[PDB]
Design a protein around this ligand. Structure first.
Ligand SMILES: *[C@@H]1O[C@H](CO)[C@@H](O)[C@H](O)[C@H]1NC(C)=O
Ligand SMILES: N=C(N)c1ccc(Cl)cc1
Ligand code: NA
Ligand code: NA
Lengths: 251, 28, 11
């Protein structure tokens, strides 16, 4: 995260770190949506242009974390993966359309002060909140600048951007399964996700019921925190029927 | 979950985090 | 760069 700040303890208790077993390293962010399901970006797991195609046994998830690099004894919980599910129409060839994946854990994780699931939006919460100028929050352990790494989880609040401005900022084809967020050059304030934040959550706190909802997944950007560029996020609500179908049939 | 999105150290104790108000103020 | 995690999670 660029131009963010250190998270408070327990501020993002749904935040998950996707961790490579060998060599031991951060791969991506992710989020906890129930005691046995973790949501992330498909490109964290499958990206053939970079020879990336992880299997379950390659990976672990670390839940309840704050420090990036420490083993947070008595706080974090480390879970193995039973199964990866990637959206069947994830478009890694062109523009990362439908950049969404689920991971089922081998055993349920116990909730705690530090470990708690985020809500997924209903149609009405999505319609109400996914409006240009409304701010969400992005969290992760990724790089602090495009060209460096945080001690602890970073947080930044960013406004959703009008769809024409998103489209006019890039040559990539934008789809209805994406939204973009960030400040405009004339707005002064700054901030973005960056390398290593992919797969983590874009959340909004509903003013109707005071619950946090995951509206987006950190998906892609061209650089980090560049003027006139914006971060792109997977539109979780638009893909929720697939999420539900996976959970209903494999959970 | 019935309990989703309510943080133990924040909403469940009626404590506010340092920047959540910035989000609320944008919801106009 | 990362602190070693317990061996039980790698077995
Ligand atoms: C990814 O790997 C699995 C085997 O691990 C394979 O069945 C699948 O087709 C691969 N996907 C691509 C796009 O190469
Ligand atoms: N440069 C990146 N890796 C990047 C990825 C995702 C976002 Cl939303 C912003 C930047
Ligand atoms: Na364009
Ligand atoms: Na920017």
């Amino acid at each position: 995260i660029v131009e963010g700040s250190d998270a408070e303890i327990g501020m993002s208790p749904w935040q998950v770190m996707l961790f490579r077993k060998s060599p031991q390293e951060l791969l991506c962010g992710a989020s906890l949506i129930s005691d046995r399901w973790v949501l992330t970006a498909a490109h964290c797991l499958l990206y053939p242009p970079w020879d990336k195609n992880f299997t379950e046994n390659d990976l672990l998830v670390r839940i309840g974390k704050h420090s990036r690099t420490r083993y947070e004894r008595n706080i974090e919980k480390i879970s193995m993966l039973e199964k990866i599910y990637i959206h069947p129409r994830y478009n890694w060839r062109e523009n990362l359309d439908r950049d969404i994946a689920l991971m089922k854990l081998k055993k349920p994780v116990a909730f705690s002060d530090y470990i708690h699931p985020v809500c997924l939006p209903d149609r009405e919460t999505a319609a109400s909140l996914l409006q240009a100028g409304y701010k969400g929050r992005v969290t992760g352990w990724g790089n602090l600048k495009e060209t460096g790494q945080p001690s602890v989880l970073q947080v930044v609040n960013l406004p959703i951007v009008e769809r024409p401005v998103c489209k006019d900022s890039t040559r990539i084809r934008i789809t209805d399964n994406m939204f973009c967020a960030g400040y405009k050059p004339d707005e002064g304030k700054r901030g973005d996700a960056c390398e290593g934040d992919s797969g983590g959550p874009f959340v909004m706190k509903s003013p109707f019921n005071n619950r946090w909802y995951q509206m987006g997944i950190v998906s892609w950007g061209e650089g980090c925190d560049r003027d006139g560029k914006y971060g792109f996020y997977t539109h979780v609500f638009r893909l929720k029927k697939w999420i539900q179908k996976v959970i209903d049939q494999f959970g | 979950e019935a309990d989703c999105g309510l943080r133990p150290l924040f909403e469940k104790k009626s404590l506010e985090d340092k920047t959540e108000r910035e989000l609320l103020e944008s919801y106009i | 760069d990362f602190e070693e995690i317990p061996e039980e999670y790698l077995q």
